[PDB]
Design a protein around this ligand. Structure first.
Ligand code: MG
Ligand code: MG
Ligand code: MG
Ligand code: MG
Lengths: 151, 202, 132, 70, 119
RNA sequence: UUAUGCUAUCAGGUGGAUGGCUCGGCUCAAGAGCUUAUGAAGGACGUGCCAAGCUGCGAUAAGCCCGGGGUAGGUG
RNA sequence: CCCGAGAAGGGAGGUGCAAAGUGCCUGAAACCUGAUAGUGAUGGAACGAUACGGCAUGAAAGGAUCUCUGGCAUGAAGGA
RNA sequence: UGUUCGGGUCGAAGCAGGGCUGUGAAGUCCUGUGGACCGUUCACAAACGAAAAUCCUGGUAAUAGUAGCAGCAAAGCAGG
């Protein structure tokens, strides 16, 4: 419902920021994608996300390893997230545009931080058998990225 | 009937929950002291009588003991006050004739008892806690007690002075002479007041 | 500041207290490290089957008067002085620098504290917590 | 009783928590149990059963005041 | 007029909060300058639109000007010169309190004003 | 660059405890104490420039007339 | 002013002593995300107490005949 | 609450983490936050101290990105 502070405060001299506010996506899948893309470059990250949305590339699922089998190539369980990939792509676009407005060079920048902070919950309901109604809720996510000109 | 205007019934056993009373059309506990909105176990009661009794002989004896304590310079001095007079202070009967606060202040300055009045004035300070919201905003100090034999304009002139309490001889009690159960209160008398106390409390 | 006047018996007692209070337990309630609802103060164990209350050597140590420090140097600062907590500038006259050191109260302001510290520096009294 | 003396005692000076239930931990209400199970206490207190003597009306009776010669 | 039997804060704040709107005219009171008080005999007066005030407390100690408006319910007056700026830049009146001002020039146009001030 | 993890601290999210404040509540005391067929209390419906709820009012409808108090703003 | 399909939202830049940014005073814990220190894919458990070591920290509020290493004098029970 | 002596925008209460004192209940001080109130001597009071009641109210985990989104009417494809 409001703004958010960042868990890391890089110097504004060589730094770009961006936040995705209250995205309606799964926090676990977004956590896995954010883990995968941290430390890479901007162009490499965008190419990898393009290949993920195209179903040509699998992200490794290490913490939330359930509901998945092992994928081709050299890895254990992994999936093909789509919605989380598109949300992260939008946030990356915004961060690169902000950095180029700062007068910096996007092509030689790194994702030095990408986290998720799940936000408020809208409380829905679903009717069960024998007269009970258990909740079903709309989880939200906050995505944060920081780009830096140092490795 | 606070916390008890309800028709709650227990669900009994077999329902998987506790045995407290609950609402008839819901599962919310009520009426019991550990349930939210329930009554209070052992609250205060308006019919409790908290008055105390003291026999007249021992009450008069305590009053005499407190009156005789103002003669001792040590009890008065260590109790808090500041004075430069020869205890006890006795004044001529025209003190009941004073009608302006300025005249009373002149007399107190000339009798070496005005620094206590100033101490009470500057010691007035804001109280701490929930007492501020209920009417007791400050904490006051006690300076000086003036005693007169009969009602006169002096009970109206030395009335606004900070800390000073002026009373007649037929209105002395133990609070006036032992504020907080500590005797040694600075006081002033007159000749008529001395006349009134031949067998006053014996 | 006035040199301390620890005469030899009191110096011996002071070193004895240093050693003994070195070898003293923490006196923490039972199972305070296995739940977070419990704070780390001391409560007497009360159940009949409890292992600490039954005085098992591995469970810890019960609170008892055997751990008391020597009566001559009880309450003294580890520097050897006795600390009195000062909350006004009308209480430095009721202090002697030979064995007492003041501790200015926490809530004193800045200029009040400056005046107190000036009068304490001149008086020879040692100040434990002074911003310097 | 001194309530503060028993903060942390649980039973509060009663023994088991199965005591202090109600009127059955006292043997009945009032002077109940006259001569079945409280007979000895009934005799020692001064509540023995029986009726003994008669009374005259208070209209006719008098209670004289006395004073000795000494 | 609420006597010494109203020494409870709850009662005083009720009286000041839910007041009849003809009593809120009295809360628009401000001190008079020396000449005004020594020629009308009232130590104070009420502030009305069209008179010159001298601010005494706050950020504008010493600035003078007319009263541009008065609101009874709010309890605040508006003065010439005393302004605040928007973020985009637009000078706006800043409300004050009539007990922080001094009256130096009364505005006599009602005719009933003189009687209203005193007696 | 040892992955999945364990312990402790820090930064952030969620959450709404603690503290400070309070036009509310409760108890005691002193007063005052009936109203309606000349249509009561209570209810339904309506009534605002933009007006859904509450409050007030009744097709003259957040209201009309007269006397006093009050004085420069008012439109719950 | 720039990004964005945008009356969403983000960045930069302002207002204010202070963001206190609209259900906006302070803002705890459970719970969740990241970072730092120790440890870690040959390993046995009421999660700790006591003694000895490794690694990390030890600004304030704690020590300066205090910490470390040795010499000398007296030395109780015991005593080669 | 009565009484004595005080502190605070040159920064009170509260909160997070630390140093010292006490056998202990606990006290006091330091650092970060906070932006307005808080103590103390001698006494007196109580709607006065929580780890547990298949305790009450609120918030929130694991289970878990799992079950379900099939059974009685298996419905969609091309071009624009
Ligand atoms: Mg979802
Ligand atoms: Mg049904
Ligand atoms: Mg209630
Ligand atoms: Mg609890």
């Amino acid at each position: 419902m409001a703004r958010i502070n960042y868990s890391i405060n890089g110097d504004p001299e060589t730094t770009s920021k961006a936040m995705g506010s209250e995205l309606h996506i799964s926090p676990k899948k977004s956590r896995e994608v954010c883990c995968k893309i941290k430390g890479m470059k901007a162009s490499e990250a965008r190419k990898f996300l393009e290949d993920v949305i195209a179903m040509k590339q699998a992200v490794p699922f290490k913490k939330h390893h359930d509901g998945s089998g092992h994928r081709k190539g050299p890895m254990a369980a992994g999936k093909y997230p789509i919605s989380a990939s598109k949300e992260i792509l939008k946030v990356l676009k915004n961060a690169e545009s902000n950095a180029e407005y700062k007068g910096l060079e996007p092509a030689n920048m790194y994702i030095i931080h990408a986290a998720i902070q799940r936000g408020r919950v809208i409380h829905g309901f679903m009717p069960r058998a024998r007269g009970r109604a258990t909740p079903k809720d709309t989880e939200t996510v906050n995505i944060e990225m920081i780009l830096s000109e140092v490795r | 009937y606070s916390g008890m205007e309800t028709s709650a019934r227990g669900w009994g056993s077999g329902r998987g929950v506790s045995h407290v009373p609950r609402l008839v059309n819901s599962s919310r506990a009520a009426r019991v002291p550990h349930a939210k909105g329930g009554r209070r176990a052992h609250p205060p009661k308006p019919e409790a009588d908290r008055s105390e009794k003291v026999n007249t002989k021992e009450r008069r004896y305590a009053i005499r003991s407190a009156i005789a304590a103002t003669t001792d310079p040590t009890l008065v001095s260590l109790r808090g006050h500041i004075f430069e007079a020869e205890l006890p202070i006795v004044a001529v009967n025209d003190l009941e004739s004073l009608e302006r606060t300025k005249q009373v202040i002149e007399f107190l300055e000339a009798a070496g008892l005005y620094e206590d009045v100033l101490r009470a004035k500057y010691g007035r300070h804001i109280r701490a806690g929930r007492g501020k919201l209920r009417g007791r905003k400050y904490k006051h100090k006690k300076s000086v007690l003036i005693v007169a034999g009969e009602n006169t304009p002096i009970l109206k002139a030395a009335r606004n002075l900070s800390g000073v309490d002026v009373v007649t001889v037929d209105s002395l009690n133990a609070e006036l002479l032992a504020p907080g159960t500590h005797a040694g209160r600075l006081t002033v008398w007159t000749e008529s007041a001395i006349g009134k106390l031949e067998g006053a409390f014996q | 500041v006035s040199t301390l006047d620890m005469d030899p018996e009191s110096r011996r007692l002071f070193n004895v207290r240093k050693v003994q209070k070195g070898k003293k337990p923490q006196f923490k309630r039972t199972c305070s490290h296995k739940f977070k609802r419990l704070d780390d103060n001391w409560r007497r164990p009360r159940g009949s089957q409890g292992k600490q209350r039954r005085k098992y050597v591995s469970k810890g140590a019960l609170v008892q008067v055997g751990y008391g420090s020597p009566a001559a140097v009880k309450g003294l600062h580890p520097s050897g002085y006795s600390d009195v907590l000062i909350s006004s500038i009308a209480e430095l006259e009721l202090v002697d620098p030979s064995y007492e050191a003041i501790r200015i109260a926490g809530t004193i302001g800045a200029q009040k504290k400056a005046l107190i510290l000036a009068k304490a520096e001149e008086a020879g009294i040692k100040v434990l917590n002074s911003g310097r | 009783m001194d309530t503060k003396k028993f903060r942390g005692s649980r039973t509060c000076g009663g023994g088991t928590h199965k005591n202090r239930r109600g009127a059955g931990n006292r043997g009945g209400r009032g002077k109940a149990g006259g001569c079945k199970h409280h007979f000895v206490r009934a005799m020692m207190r001064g509540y023995s059963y029986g009726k003994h003597g008669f009374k005259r009306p208070d209209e006719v009776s008098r209670d004289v005041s006395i004073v000795n010669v000494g | 007029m609420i006597a010494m039997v109203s020494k409870q804060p709850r009662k005083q704040r009720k009286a000041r909060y839910a007041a009849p709107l003809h009593i809120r005219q009295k809360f628009m009171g401000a001190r008079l300058s020396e000449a005004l008080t020594k020629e009308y005999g009232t130590r104070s007066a009420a502030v009305i639109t069209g008179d010159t005030v001298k601010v005494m407390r706050g950020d504008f100690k010493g600035t003078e000007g007319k009263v541009q408006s008065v609101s009874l319910m709010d309890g605040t007056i508006t003065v010439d010169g005393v302004i605040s700026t928007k973020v985009d830049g637009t000078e706006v009146p800043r409300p004050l309190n009539p007990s922080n001002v001094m009256i130096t020039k009364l505005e006599m146009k009602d005719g009933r004003r003189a009687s209203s001030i005193k007696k």
